[PDB]
Amino acid sequence: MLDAFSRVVVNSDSKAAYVGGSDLQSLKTFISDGNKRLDAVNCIVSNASCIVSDAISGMICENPGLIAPGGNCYTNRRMAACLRDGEIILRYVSYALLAGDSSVLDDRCLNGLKETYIALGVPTASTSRAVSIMKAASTAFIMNTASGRKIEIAAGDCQALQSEAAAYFDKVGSAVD
Amino acid sequence: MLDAFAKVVAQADARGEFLSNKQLNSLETMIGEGNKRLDIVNKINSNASTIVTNSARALFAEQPQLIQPGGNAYTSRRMAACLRDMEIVLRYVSYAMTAGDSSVLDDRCLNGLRETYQALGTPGTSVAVAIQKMKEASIALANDLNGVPLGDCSSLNSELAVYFDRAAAAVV
Amino acid sequence: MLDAFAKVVAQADARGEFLSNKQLNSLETMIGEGNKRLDIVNKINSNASTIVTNSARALFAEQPQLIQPGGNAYTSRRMAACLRDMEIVLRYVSYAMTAGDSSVLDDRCLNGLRETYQALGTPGTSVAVAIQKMKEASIALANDLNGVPLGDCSSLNSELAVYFDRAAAAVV
Amino acid sequence: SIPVLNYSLSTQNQRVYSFEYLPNEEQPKCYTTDNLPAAIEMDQIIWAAYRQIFSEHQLLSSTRQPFLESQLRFNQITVKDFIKGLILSDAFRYLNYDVNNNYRFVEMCIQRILGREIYNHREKLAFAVIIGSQGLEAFIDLLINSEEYEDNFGDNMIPYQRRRIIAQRSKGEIPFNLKTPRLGKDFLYKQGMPQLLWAGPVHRFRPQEQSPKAGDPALFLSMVQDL
Amino acid sequence: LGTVLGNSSLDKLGLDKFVDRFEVNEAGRPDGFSADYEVIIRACYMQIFANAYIMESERAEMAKAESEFRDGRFTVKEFCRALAKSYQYRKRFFDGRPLYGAIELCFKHILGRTPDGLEHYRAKSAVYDTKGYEAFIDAFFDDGEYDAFYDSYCVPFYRGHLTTSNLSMAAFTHMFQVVRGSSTSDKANPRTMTNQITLNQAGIQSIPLAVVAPGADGATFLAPDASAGSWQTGFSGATKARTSHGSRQEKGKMFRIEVANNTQYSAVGGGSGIKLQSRSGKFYKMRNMAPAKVSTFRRANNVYLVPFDELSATYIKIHKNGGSIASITPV
Amino acid sequence: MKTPITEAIASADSQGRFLSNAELQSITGRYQRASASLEAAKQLTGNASRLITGAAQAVYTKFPFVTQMPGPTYASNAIGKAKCARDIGYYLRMTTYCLVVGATGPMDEYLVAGLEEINRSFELSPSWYIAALENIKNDHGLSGQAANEANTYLDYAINVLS
Amino acid sequence: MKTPITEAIASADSQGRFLSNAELQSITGRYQRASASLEAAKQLTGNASRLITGAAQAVYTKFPFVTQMPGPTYASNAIGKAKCARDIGYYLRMTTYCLVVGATGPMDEYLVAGLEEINRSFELSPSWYIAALENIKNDHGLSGQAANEANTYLDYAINVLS
Numbered sequence A: 001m002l003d004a005f006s007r008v009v010v011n012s013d014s015k016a017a018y019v020g021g022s023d024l025q026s027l028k029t030f031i032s033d034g035n036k037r038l039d040a041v042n043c044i045v046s047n048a049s050c051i052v053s054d055a056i057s058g059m060i061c062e063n064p065g066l067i068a069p070g071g072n073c074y075t076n077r078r079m080a081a082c083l084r085d086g087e088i089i090l091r092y093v094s095y096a097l098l099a100g101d102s103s104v105l106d107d108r109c110l111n112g113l114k115e116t117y118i119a120l121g122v123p124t125a126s127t128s129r130a131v132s133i134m135k136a137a138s139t140a141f142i143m144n145t146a147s148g149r150k151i152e153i154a155a156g157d158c159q160a161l162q163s164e165a166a167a168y169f170d171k172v173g174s175a176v177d
Numbered sequence B, C: 001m002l003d004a005f006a007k008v009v010a011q012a013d014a015r016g017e018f019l020s021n022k023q024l025n026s027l028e029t030m031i032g033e034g035n036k037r038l039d040i041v042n043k044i045n046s047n048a049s050t051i052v053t054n055s056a057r058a059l060f061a062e063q064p065q066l067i068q069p070g071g072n073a074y075t076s077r078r079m080a081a082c083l084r085d086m087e088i089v090l091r092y093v094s095y096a097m098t099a100g101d102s103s104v105l106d107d108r109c110l111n112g113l114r115e116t117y118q119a120l121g122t123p124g125t126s127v128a129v130a131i132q133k134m135k136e137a138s139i140a141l142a143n144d145l146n147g148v149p150l151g152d153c154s155s156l157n158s159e160l161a162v163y164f165d166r167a168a169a170a171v172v
Numbered sequence D: 001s002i003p004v005l006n007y008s009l010s011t012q013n014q015r016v017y018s019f020e021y022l023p024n025e026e027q028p029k030c031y032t033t034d035n036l037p038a039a040i041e042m043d044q045i046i047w048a049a050y051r052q053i054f055s056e057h058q059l060l061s062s063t064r065q066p067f068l069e070s071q072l073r074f075n076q077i078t079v080k081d082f083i084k085g086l087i088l089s090d091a092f093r094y095l096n097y098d099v100n101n102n103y104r105f106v107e108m109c110i111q112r113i114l115g116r117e118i119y120n121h122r123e124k125l126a127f128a129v130i131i132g133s134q135g136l137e138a139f140i141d142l143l144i145n146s147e148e149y150e151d152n153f154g155d156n157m158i159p160y161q162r163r164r165i166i167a168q169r170s171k172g173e174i175p176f177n178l179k180t181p182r183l184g185k186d187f188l189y190k191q192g193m194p195q196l197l198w199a200g201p202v203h204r205f206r207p208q209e210q211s212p213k214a215g216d217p218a219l220f221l222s223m224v225q226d227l
Numbered sequence E: 001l002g003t004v005l006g007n008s009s010l011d012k013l014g015l016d017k018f019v020d021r022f023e024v025n026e027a028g029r030p031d032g033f034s035a036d037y038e039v040i041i042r043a044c045y046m047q048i049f050a051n052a053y054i055m056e057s058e059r060a061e062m063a064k065a066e067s068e069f070r071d072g073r074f075t076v077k078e079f080c081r082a083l084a085k086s087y088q089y090r091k092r093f094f095d096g097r098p099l100y101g102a103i104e105l106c107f108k109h110i111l112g113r114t115p116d117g118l119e120h121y122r123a124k125s126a127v128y129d130t131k132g133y134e135a136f137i138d139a140f141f142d143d144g145e146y147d148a149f150y151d152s153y154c155v156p157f158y159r160g161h162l163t164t165s166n167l168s169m170a171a172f173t174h175m176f177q178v179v180r181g182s183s184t185s186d187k188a189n190p191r192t193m194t195n196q197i198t199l200n201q202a203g204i205q206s207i208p209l210a211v212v213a214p215g216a217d218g219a220t221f222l223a224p225d226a227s228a229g230s231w232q233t234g235f236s237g238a239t240k241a242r243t244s245h246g247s248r249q250e251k252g253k254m255f256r257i258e259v260a261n262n263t264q265y266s267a268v269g270g271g272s273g274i275k276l277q278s279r280s281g282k283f284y285k286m287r288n289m290a291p292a293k294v295s296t297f298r299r300a301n302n303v304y305l306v307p308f309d310e311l312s313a314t315y316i317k318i319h320k321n322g323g324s325i326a327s328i329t330p331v
Numbered sequence F, G: 001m002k003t004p005i006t007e008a009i010a011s012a013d014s015q016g017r018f019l020s021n022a023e024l025q026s027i028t029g030r031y032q033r034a035s036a037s038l039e040a041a042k043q044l045t046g047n048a049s050r051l052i053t054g055a056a057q058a059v060y061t062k063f064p065f066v067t068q069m070p071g072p073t074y075a076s077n078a079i080g081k082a083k084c085a086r087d088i089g090y091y092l093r094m095t096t097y098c099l100v101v102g103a104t105g106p107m108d109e110y111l112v113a114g115l116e117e118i119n120r121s122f123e124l125s126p127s128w129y130i131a132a133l134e135n136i137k138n139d140h141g142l143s144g145q146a147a148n149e150a151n152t153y154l155d156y157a158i159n160v161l162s
């Protein structure tokens, strides 16, 4: 596991040199953008089970073959494991928003997952669909544009960070496909 | 590849003996019932494409997953691969129904194949349901009392259901 | 490649007709005599090596030039090549004895061959003498009244002599 | 490094789509490590492969290669590497190579490995240069690693004669090992021509008076017996 | 990932997550906080079931034993034993698969190494056949090994990769066949899902497999099976052999290369997009210029033994067909 | 042409060897079915005309648009009717050949090869011929093993067009 | 192993094809010779012992030097006699297998392949066994078609060693 700090340290370690002024300046921009990242992680963490609810309910309600008898959502137990997997995907994505680096997600959640879903018989296109719904849902919560919960935040711009979170979800969705 | 005979000779030689009289008597019984065997295989081959396609209609109708986008059945090319796969498994079941022993079905078709339907992300459980859609049709045509002498065929329909259950057991 | 049957059906289709009753009846007569044909081909195959080597002994003894240095039987490798060529021509005569029609013998072996034993400096006239040493032996084993019931086989022996005469006529 | 010169191109059978759906005949059976053959079917692949390169009479107990067999049966090589290491084996070089006039060995290589006749004389020219400089090794490297050979045989298949016989006809084309035997019509010319081969002429003798003349009925006899 | 980045080879092998360790450091019964125990409890399920999925319904199973860990009754040794005896652990690991499969799992769950030699397998199978199942489980727990490594107060961890526990070099490679990633558990991994023994020819004969690091091109793969030649007849076209004996070793050392995803759609012949045999749709390779309906690659995953001077060429050809390379080990 | 006989010759040719007993067993089995095969073959030739006419009529009754569609390819002219009966005549001819030869070799050679490309380039469809062969299969009037010899091949062509 | 059955399924498999009527005719013909094949197979098993002892004795009478040579290969010991009867026993065993199977597959698999290298490395002449098989071919005592089934294979092994 590596944050932004550790990635600057590792790159400067293979460079075999001190971090210096330039790397440090970009990391100063990380720190000044810190509280926006904090409130952003608070936005994704709050109402997150509701995100998983809406996402998987959208996945099944768009594609009704999963709940059809013989499908991979067809069993009550299978629906339980389905819901929990959505929850854990969103969990490690939330970690990748705190760390500012995808190292936790790449080392821990992303790796071995294609071979697991393929090893179970889980349809991968449906998983990338659910990851996509959590992506747009998560960006709409992170931009205070949720149609049900428009909570108070101080006004500002955070398009950078929304592109960052969309990069993590697209990393998972490209990882399962 | 081995038929029913070459397996008995292979065991007998691997022990390095003559074939015993009792073994010969039972083997005479197998030869003495072989017309029925030819008949069954003829009643499968002469309906084979209809078997495949009708089981495909049943399959895609009961599981509507496969056909829609994001599914293996959806691609035009992959749809043909799906149909072909069913044809292949029917072909080898017919071979191993003629030879008597599950030998050609266990080396040319079924061997390594569950490993392969996990490298393609294809639900092998749904493939075994496709084979379960072929077994019922194939036996239902095998037990047609029509054109053929009446009599006893149960001991051989039991021998047909073995292979279809073996393919279904081996893709999963 | 064409047997007895496929020649008749190939002519009939090449004219685009049904088979008349007369063709069907003669074809019934050929089917009604086919056991004798199988018997001859059994009696050639099960003695084939002996046929080859005895005709080789006869050939080399009668025409000593091939065996001595300079000739074509002189080289040990060439000698072995000589023998197995005799085995080859015997093999295709056995094929065309089964099929009834000189079809496999006239496309795979004999056609092109006289051209080949003119690119190697091999006397094809001597090869035809070897075939004349195999015809004698093969018919002399074909007419063995032993283990086989008595009957009339001149109408078939004569046909067999056709193929051995055709190879001898076609390597020269 | 001086590539192969641009040559012409002819039209043979191997470049059409003959619609032999549910093919009835004349397809070699197929000899492939793909079907996971047991001991026997392995031996049938091995013998067929030997005949295809060495072809018939040349294959013999002495030429036979035990070691490449023992490697092939155990999975240590591909069939394509077996065919290659076959041609590099020297028993194939003493017979079919030391005899053949360089342009002619090009026939038996492009034709015993690819299963097609040469397009024209120019093909024999170019490929004979590259075997004249690089050695036999890199020539066989050229044929095997070629796009064509990968396109139709892949990694484990014995080469066959492509489209020798048409579906509706019997004649087709003469068999391959028949077509290019080994000795070249003109190879001997440089040495002493074969001698003491008369006995064969001595044995078959016809008086001149017995020989048919023009206009007799007997000359056409053969036609009558075929009808 | 990359062995070089960060100066640590092991973490990027997929075993980075499993460093976390869990020793109860609190003496005396915890009456009300209920925090450390629910974490340690959860870690016991993560170890013993190896990330298998247990639900509220399935939390009713082993609720008693769970309520005995929380009391001065069981050490985590004995709690882990109690989780290992129960209905669940038998459903998953024991009933579904054979003893060799089951034996190998029981070492992944209880000791966290793999069995190395056949002697471990003989011992545990014989304990089983003499006495049954519960003495099988005891015979894992009731040995010097578990007591020494964990000392009855530490939740079990993976140590088979480590050099400190004594195991045969193969137990290293076998270690990584048994553990693939944080995600891969028991039902999920292809090699050992349910019934199939994870290790058969390899586990028994101490064949060092190779490592395919999890993820990337080689993430999805499984070795093709080999038979034994004329005696005990078996097919010989299934895979390249591990050995490469003989004269070929000329032209440089033999490299055993594993290719991982072979597929019709991916196989292109070097030129982008799927080539069409006929003008209208026919896509399999023509045999004798007659349509065949046989897949160009029969199974996804053929191996290649290739000597050094032919490497580059082979390396090209795999990438021409869109096959992806799992692992390349010098042989 | 694929016979049993040429199949056996072809296999033992490919193995480079003299015919073994195996092949002779195969030839035996061709000869011991050939009598029923010829009984079947004579009756189909014996009433081939009425089978053709009945078949084309059945094609028309099942597909009534064919006799009504203004087109080159449809039997609404005086040409597509005669050509309709021409092609049906061909199938029945090939079935009688296969009954004489004793495999599907004549039909696989003279009929089956490249027929999809004909039915693709000329707007031809399997259903029109499928319907014809169903009528022939229902109304040939053979009995016993001769009927099985007819229905084998008649089914076989249906397997080809489907 | 090469049977008629595995040969036909192998050929139809290599052509990418179902079992058509041709191969079924071949399997039929295997079944309608198999009764004579088994009658031949039971009498060979029924008196295998005396066939072996008489065979080895015939080999000794024809070749008197074999029982007199000092060398180990020759049956001048108490060992080469037992090993002599051992090898003759092998051939008679394989013939009985091929009479059961219906082709020469068991002999070609278990016995024929590699036999030159044995008879070349151990200085064993091909004729010895030729003489043995000639006695068995003369004294098996079968009659009719069963005798043809035996003499086919017994001749076949002689064609192998010559």
Ligand SMILES: C=CC1=C(C)[C@@H](Cc2[nH]c(/C=C3N=C(/C=C4\NC(=O)[C@H](C)[C@H]4CC)C(C)=C\3CCC(=O)O)c(CCC(=O)O)c2C)NC1=O
Binding pocket: A056, A066, A072, A073, A074, A077, A078, A079, A081, A082, A083, A085, A086, A088, A089, A108, A109, A113, A116, A120, A122, A123, A126, A127, A130, E051, E052, E053, E182, E183, E184, E185, E186, E187, E188
């Ligand atoms: C650390 C990260 C991490 C993950 C991301 C998951 C991934 C994961 N999911 C499952 C397992 C599962 N995952 C699902 C989920 C699905 N149900 C469906 O209808 C959908 C296709 C899909 C949700 C979108 C299901 C149903 C199972 C159980 C499958 C089964 O037993 O049939 C398993 C096997 C073990 C188990 O059964 O729990 C694993 C490793 N686990 C982890 O440890």
Ligand SMILES: C=CC1=C(C)[C@@H](Cc2[nH]c(/C=C3N=C(/C=C4\NC(=O)[C@H](C)[C@H]4CC)C(C)=C\3CCC(=O)O)c(CCC(=O)O)c2C)NC1=O
Binding pocket: A032, A033, A034, A035, A036, A037, A038, A039, A040, A042, A142, A143, A144, A153, A154, A155, A156, A157, A158
């Ligand atoms: C422990 C919990 C915890 C949090 C939840 C955050 C909450 C937080 N956010 C900001 C501050 C802020 N928060 C946002 C966030 C945004 N504004 C927008 O218009 C977008 C809707 C949204 C995108 C995420 C912005 C833009 C600021 C002000 C800019 C900045 O301080 O960087 C501040 C600065 C102090 C202040 O404003 O009084 C704090 C403490 N920090 C914490 O320590």
Ligand SMILES: C=CC1=C(C)[C@@H](Cc2[nH]c(/C=C3N=C(/C=C4\NC(=O)[C@H](C)[C@H]4CC)C(C)=C\3CCC(=O)O)c(CCC(=O)O)c2C)NC1=O
Binding pocket: B066, B072, B073, B078, B079, B081, B082, B083, B085, B086, B088, B089, B108, B109, B116, B120, B122, B123, B126, B127, B130, E262, E263, E264, E265, E294, E295, E296, E297, E298, E299, E300
């Ligand atoms: C010699 C025997 C032999 C077989 C038996 C097949 C088996 C097989 N099928 C596929 C491949 C395939 N097989 C199917 C078939 C299926 N479609 C579905 O809806 C069903 C579940 C199923 C039919 C019942 C599909 C769809 C693919 C392509 C999968 C994909 O690319 O996603 C592949 C990979 C190569 C390819 O893409 O063609 C292989 C080896 N191939 C062989 O060589």
Ligand SMILES: C=CC1=C(C)[C@@H](Cc2[nH]c(/C=C3N=C(/C=C4\NC(=O)[C@H](C)[C@H]4CC)C(C)=C\3CCC(=O)O)c(CCC(=O)O)c2C)NC1=O
Binding pocket: B032, B033, B035, B036, B037, B038, B039, B040, B042, B142, B143, B144, B145, B146, B148, B149, B150, B151, B152, B153, B156, F033, G024, G025, G028
């Ligand atoms: C070359 C092709 C070829 C075939 C297709 C078969 C056809 C065939 N079947 C039987 C004969 C028979 N066939 C069947 C078959 C069955 N009867 C039932 O009621 C079941 C529906 C069905 C199960 C398979 C039975 C029961 C007999 C009679 C019993 C017997 O002869 O063993 C006979 C004996 C002769 C006769 O009846 O006139 C023949 C030749 N044999 C061949 O040589």
Ligand SMILES: C=CC1=C(C)[C@@H](Cc2[nH]c(/C=C3N=C(/C=C4\NC(=O)[C@H](C)[C@H]4CC)C(C)=C\3CCC(=O)O)c(CCC(=O)O)c2C)NC1=O
Binding pocket: C066, C072, C073, C077, C078, C079, C081, C082, C083, C085, C086, C088, C089, C108, C109, C113, C116, C120, C122, C123, C126, C127, C130, D055, D056, D057, D058, D175, D177, D178, D181, D182
């Ligand atoms: C399919 C049919 C078919 C054939 C009929 C043969 C014909 C044939 N024979 C030879 C080749 C040969 N054929 C013979 C035979 C002869 N020795 C003599 O003393 C006699 C004149 C004559 C036997 C009657 C010899 C000796 C050679 C080798 C010639 C040489 O190398 O000098 C060759 C060249 C290849 C080789 O060396 O084997 C060919 C094509 N091959 C086939 O594929």
Ligand SMILES: C=CC1=C(C)[C@@H](Cc2[nH]c(/C=C3N=C(/C=C4\NC(=O)[C@H](C)[C@H]4CC)C(C)=C\3CCC(=O)O)c(CCC(=O)O)c2C)NC1=O
Binding pocket: C033, C035, C036, C037, C038, C039, C040, C042, C142, C143, C144, C145, C146, C148, C149, C150, C151, C152, C153, F024, F025, F028, G033, G144, G145, G148
């Ligand atoms: C599979 C191998 C196989 C064979 C090798 C043949 C063997 C064979 N031959 C005959 C039967 C016969 N075989 C011969 C043959 C001849 N008699 C003569 O005196 C001539 C020497 C010789 C010339 C070829 C004759 C004349 C008959 C009896 C007439 C007849 O059945 O047509 C029969 C009829 C049944 C019986 O006699 O018991 C059989 C099965 N058939 C086979 O299926």
Ligand SMILES: C=CC1=C(C)[C@@H](Cc2[nH]c(/C=C3N=C(/C=C4\NC(=O)[C@H](C)[C@H]4CC)C(C)=C\3CCC(=O)O)c(CCC(=O)O)c2C)NC1=O
Binding pocket: E007, E008, E009, E010, E161, E162, E163, E164, E167, E172
């Ligand atoms: C029973 C026998 C036995 C062995 C032979 C070793 C072999 C071995 N070495 C390492 C592990 C290691 N081995 C080395 C050694 C090397 N450092 C270098 O600069 C050189 C290339 C090389 C010494 C010549 C290093 C550096 C590691 C740690 C690698 C890493 O973590 O990056 C590991 C993994 C476990 C660990 O980290 O200790 C193992 C199994 N272990 C055993 O149990």
Ligand SMILES: C=CC1=C(C)[C@@H](Cc2[nH]c(/C=C3N=C(/C=C4\NC(=O)[C@H](C)[C@H]4CC)C(C)=C\3CCC(=O)O)c(CCC(=O)O)c2C)NC1=O
Binding pocket: D067, D069, D070, D071, D073, D074, E228, E229, E230, E231, E232, E245, E246, E247
């Ligand atoms: C380049 C060097 C080189 C070698 C040294 C060999 C080694 C070798 N031997 C065998 C294979 C074999 N080797 C033997 C030999 C044995 N029989 C016994 O009774 C003894 C124990 C032993 C002789 C002393 C046998 C019997 C087989 C076949 C084993 C089987 O199929 O059961 C195989 C597998 C392939 C095959 O079946 O041939 C290989 C690679 N091969 C090579 O390429």
Ligand SMILES: C=CC1=C(C)[C@@H](Cc2[nH]c(/C=C3N=C(/C=C4\NC(=O)[C@H](C)[C@H]4CC)C(C)=C\3CCC(=O)O)c(CCC(=O)O)c2C)NC1=O
Binding pocket: F059, F066, F071, F072, F073, F074, F075, F076, F079, F080, F081, F083, F084, F085, F087, F088, F090, F091, F110, F111, F118, F122, F128, F129
């Ligand atoms: C050897 C076998 C063999 C066949 C089976 C036929 C098949 C066949 N039919 C046609 C051609 C034709 N076939 C038909 C027949 C039809 N009219 C209809 O109303 C019905 C749908 C159908 C009869 C049931 C017609 C009408 C044509 C001419 C089509 C046109 O020119 O538009 C052609 C193109 C050449 C031609 O114009 O004759 C061919 C190859 N030909 C063969 O050589």
Ligand SMILES: C=CC1=C(C)[C@@H](Cc2[nH]c(/C=C3N=C(/C=C4\NC(=O)[C@H](C)[C@H]4CC)C(C)=C\3CCC(=O)O)c(CCC(=O)O)c2C)NC1=O
Binding pocket: G056, G059, G066, G071, G072, G073, G074, G075, G076, G079, G080, G081, G083, G084, G085, G087, G088, G090, G091, G110, G111, G118, G122, G124, G128, G129, G132
């Ligand atoms: C599967 C088939 C099969 C066979 C057919 C035999 C063939 C065979 N025989 C011997 C070996 C032998 N075979 C004989 C037999 C002979 N004694 C004589 O006086 C006669 C000439 C002759 C009997 C007719 C003898 C004597 C030996 C031992 C030779 C020696 O050691 O000198 C050996 C070498 C191994 C050994 O010593 O046993 C083999 C392979 N083995 C097989 O596995």
Ligand SMILES: CCC1=C(C)[C@@H](CC2=N/C(=C\c3[nH]c(C[C@@H]4NC(=O)C(C)=C4CC)c(C)c3CCC(=O)O)C(CCC(=O)O)=C2C)NC1=O
Binding pocket: A047, A050, A051, A053, A054, A055, A057, A058, A059, A061, A062, A132, A133, A136, A137, A138, A140, A141, A145, A146, A147, A148, A149
């Ligand atoms: C009829 C079958 C069906 C569903 C089920 C939904 C599922 C769904 N939710 C979406 C997307 C989505 N979902 C939510 C979460 C959700 N909204 C909230 O305000 C709260 C409190 C939530 C949890 C209770 C958000 C926040 C978004 C982003 C859009 C938005 O701003 O609302 C999207 C858009 C996906 C995309 O952008 O690609 C879909 C398809 N749609 C369907 O057609």
